[PDB]
Design an enzyme around this catalytic site. Structure first.
Site, PDB file in Angstrom:
ATOM      1  N   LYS A 116      82.472  73.718  -4.676  1.00 30.83           N
ATOM      2  CA  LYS A 116      81.992  74.879  -5.722  1.00 30.83           C
ATOM      3  C   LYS A 116      83.069  75.001  -6.749  1.00 30.83           C
ATOM      4  O   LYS A 116      82.456  74.912  -7.945  1.00 30.83           O
ATOM      5  CB  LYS A 116      81.635  76.334  -5.094  1.00 30.83           C
ATOM      6  CG  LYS A 116      80.282  76.280  -4.559  1.00 30.83           C
ATOM      7  CD  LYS A 116      80.070  75.539  -3.392  1.00 30.83           C
ATOM      8  CE  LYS A 116      78.622  74.794  -3.374  1.00 30.83           C
ATOM      9  NZ  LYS A 116      77.881  74.392  -2.016  1.00 30.83           N
ATOM     10  N   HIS A 120      83.472  73.536   1.490  1.00 34.73           N
ATOM     11  CA  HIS A 120      82.379  74.397   0.637  1.00 34.73           C
ATOM     12  C   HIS A 120      83.132  74.879  -0.470  1.00 34.73           C
ATOM     13  O   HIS A 120      82.459  74.727  -1.667  1.00 34.73           O
ATOM     14  CB  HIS A 120      81.680  75.136   1.612  1.00 34.73           C
ATOM     15  CG  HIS A 120      80.273  74.634   2.119  1.00 34.73           C
ATOM     16  ND1 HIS A 120      79.293  74.951   1.329  1.00 34.73           N
ATOM     17  CD2 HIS A 120      80.075  73.831   3.051  1.00 34.73           C
ATOM     18  CE1 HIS A 120      78.172  74.422   1.867  1.00 34.73           C
ATOM     19  NE2 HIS A 120      78.494  73.766   2.952  1.00 34.73           N
TER      20      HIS A 120
END
Lengths: 271, 271
Positions: free
Chosen positions: A163, A159
């Site tokens: 990003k 994650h």
């Protein structure tokens, strides 16, 4: 003998840049530009106090700072909507800059900076070691098309990695495997993830920003892994500083080429 | 329309070559050359029966096989002490060959083969995908010296990996990291081994032939891994077959260049 202005000094990345630049002995001007909301605020970082200016007469304020600091280079880690404005501001003033900010009208950005004829490093990925790994894979795939024909690829990406726009980077890496003859993403949540290495489970540390590229031969007797893990923003700060030092060398030498990227920086060597 | 003689067909590697060549539709001549101890023996492999000849009038025997099979290419996976003899034999007869055999007087080997003006692929590493990884690292290190200045390297290598002369290969990979600015081997026994990824233990499957190259930034916030695992000899057989197909294309085309290696094969593409 180099000074930098960190535009975006109130963010996590600007702070990391300040730390890194300070470790390298780069001077940090006590002045910055920010949004209307940030106008007037002082940013306490690394012993430095930086005064954030809003957009009131920017051009004139930046000019006066530039006259006081002829050796200035601006580091831009702002937001997509400021990229073009800021590049135009740097252009009008004539100040060299290093921009790690992602997004914005990227075409307009390149147009502006080429037109204004200033020195700049523009690179949406400032993690120089990641760029070097990408460039290796680009070259391998370019030289040896089909070298992994028939092998299967699994790609994992955490994650935090997704990003900090390294999906740009992951996509480009995948293109390289395809050109290497692979037919071909798992966005991962847990701090550990498993793969099959010659019919045997292997647990991988998948916390922070993690990328894993796993290749397997058709007969499952060959496994290749390429992995990186990044914690915090040090790698990006250190690469940003490397781009500043690179750009200072180019200005000092009066180089014909004006607009540069992280490949250019990497070819120059360690500084 | 290609036939091969597998010299060293009684070994584990010759057998794997036979299997692979057979899967690719390459014809396997029922004849071979071996040591005095192997003279007269038949080798049952992949449905084929191969008759091993000793050294009595080799040159004449090989010639007759070559007259019956003008499309022949010899695959040599023998022993260090036969490398030069065998290359001279192939030279005298004029038969093209692919040699994966390691050791021997390597200088004499290249001298002989260049003098005899035959077609050959000589490569001490036939695992083509490993060679492609090495070549990527060679290029990265060549383009971007110092890109990993200050990072620390740990290298692990299993027992099976060490023996199948991939220490040659591991050494060359390490040279690439040094040129990338690293200051710098654990020969490993257990089927699993641990490394530290951002202050967190990571267990790696280190059975069969295993290589792990782990880079860490000075501040320990960045980890890079490059790993491969190989079980059995399939990768080497498949690459040997690729070299045969490559060499057949070159003979058919009547190419000026005579002596080739696995980089040459890799650049041609998948066949």
């Amino acid at each position: 003998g180099i000074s930098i202005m960190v535009n975006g000094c109130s963010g996590k990345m600007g702070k990391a840049v300040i730390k890194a630049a300070d470790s390298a002995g780069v001077n940090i001007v006590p002045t910055s530009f920010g949004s209307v909301e940030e106008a007037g605020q002082t940013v306490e970082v690394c012993g430095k106090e930086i005064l954030v200016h809003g957009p009131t007469e920017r051009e004139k304020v930046l000019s006066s700072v530039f006259e006081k600091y002829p050796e200035l280079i601006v580091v831009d880690y702002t937001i997509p909507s400021a990229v073009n404005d800021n590049a135009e501001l740097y252009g009008k003033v004539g100040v060299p800059f290093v921009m790690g900010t992602t997004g914005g009208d990227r075409t307009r950005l390149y147009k502006t900076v080429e037109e204004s004829k200033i020195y700049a490093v523009i690179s949406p990925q400032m993690g120089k070691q990641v760029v070097a790994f990408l460039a290796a894979m680009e070259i391998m795939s370019e030289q040896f098309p089909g070298a992994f024909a028939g092998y299967s690829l699994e790609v994992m990406e955490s994650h935090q990695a997704s990003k900090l726009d390294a999906s740009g980077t992951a996509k480009a890496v995948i293109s390289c495997f395809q050109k290497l003859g692979v037919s071909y993403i798992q966005l991962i949540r847990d701090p550990k993830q498993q793969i099959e290495v010659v019919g045997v489970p292997e647990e991988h540390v998948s916390g922070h920003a993690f990328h894993l590229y796993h290749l397997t031969s058709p007969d499952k007797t060959v496994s290749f892994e390429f992995q990186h893990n990044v914690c915090g923003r040090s790698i990006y700060a250190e690469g940003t500083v490397d781009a500043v030092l690179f750009l200072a060398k180019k200005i000092r030498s009066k180089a014909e080429k004006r607009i540069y990227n992280m490949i250019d920086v990497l070819r120059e060597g360690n500084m």
